[PDB]
Amino acid sequence: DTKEQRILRYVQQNAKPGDPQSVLEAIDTYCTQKEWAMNVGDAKGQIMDAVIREYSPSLVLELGAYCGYSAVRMARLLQPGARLLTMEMNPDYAAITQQMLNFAGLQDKVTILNGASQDLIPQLKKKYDVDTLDMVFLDHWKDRYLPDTLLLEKCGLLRKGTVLLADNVIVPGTPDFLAYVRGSSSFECTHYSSYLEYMKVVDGLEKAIYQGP
Numbered sequence: 001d002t003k004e005q006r007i008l009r010y011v012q013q014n015a016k017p018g019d020p021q022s023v024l025e026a027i028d029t030y031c032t033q034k035e036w037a038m039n040v041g042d043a044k045g046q047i048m049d050a051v052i053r054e055y056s057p058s059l060v061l062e063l064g065a066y067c068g069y070s071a072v073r074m075a076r077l078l079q080p081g082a083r084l085l086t087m088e089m090n091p092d093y094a095a096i097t098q099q100m101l102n103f104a105g106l107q108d109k110v111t112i113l114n115g116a117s118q119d120l121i122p123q124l125k126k127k128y129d130v131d132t133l134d135m136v137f138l139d140h141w142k143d144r145y146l147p148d149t150l151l152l153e154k155c156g157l158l159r160k161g162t163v164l165l166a167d168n169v170i171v172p173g174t175p176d177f178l179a180y181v182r183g184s185s186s187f188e189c190t191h192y193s194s195y196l197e198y199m200k201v202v203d204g205l206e207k208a209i210y211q212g213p
């Protein structure tokens with residue numbers, strides 16, 4: 001048995017089927033009264049919600065699905081016809097994310113891509129029929145935010161106005177990523193101070209809007 005399986009089971013037993021909000025609530029409740037887990041969480045999730053609503057992205061890429069909390073959170077706010085692609089290298093977690101999304105009734109808005117971002121990103125145009133991304137949410141291994149951002153650029157997947165939203169830029173921290181988007185003329189950046197999921201440790205998200213090269 002694993003922590004991720006317990007979280008799924010808790011949602012399946014307590015949340016309301018086909019109700020994405022009840023899924024988020026049940027995951028938060030589990031993590032608030034039982035085992036901590038690395039979901040973006042409710043505080044940072046409010047900022048995520050705000051960004052999704054403001055920019056109304058038709059195509060979103062998520063790096064790092066984990067239990068699918070962020071996938072549920074973004075997907076539930078997407079406009080009809082809009083789509084989310086989520087990359088997850090761990091097949092156990094990909095399987096959990098799929099069951100979470102199924103439960104939430106969001107399976108038709110989300111496609112889970114299995115594998116590591118550095119290998120999937122270069123297949124997006126040919127294999128998954130992507131032109132450009134409107135939004136990217138980064139929440140995978142922290143030392144990979146910068147390399148994956150450069151890879152997305154190199155592959156021609158960013159357009160002017162593409163919104164990158166990055167979790168955990170303070171804790172655990174993505175100092176290299178921040179130095180890059182804040183120093184580069186190719187991004188205009190806005191920092192959102194909040195709190196780490198399920199506690200009062202200060203963390204934040206960085207919003208970095210691609211300007212073109």
Ligand SMILES: CCCNc1ncnc2c1ncn2[C@@H]1O[C@H](/C=C/CNC(=O)c2cc(-c3ccc(F)cc3)cc(O)c2O)[C@@H](O)[C@H]1O
Nearest residue numbers: 038064066087088089090093115116117139140141144172
């Ligand atoms: C080298 C491969 C990089 N490419 C990748 N491609 C696809 N999926 C990837 C992935 N890397 C990681 N993943 C997956 O993303 C998820 C990993 C996320 C890493 N997250 C964290 O480390 C993290 C950690 C904390 C944390 C904060 C404070 C603390 F004391 C302890 C932990 C808080 C967070 O909000 C976090 O997001 C997993 O599901 C993993 O399988």
Ligand SMILES: [Cl-]
Nearest residue numbers: 041042043198
């Ligand atoms: Cl929270």
Ligand SMILES: [Mg+2]
Nearest residue numbers: 040139167168
């Ligand atoms: Mg995170």
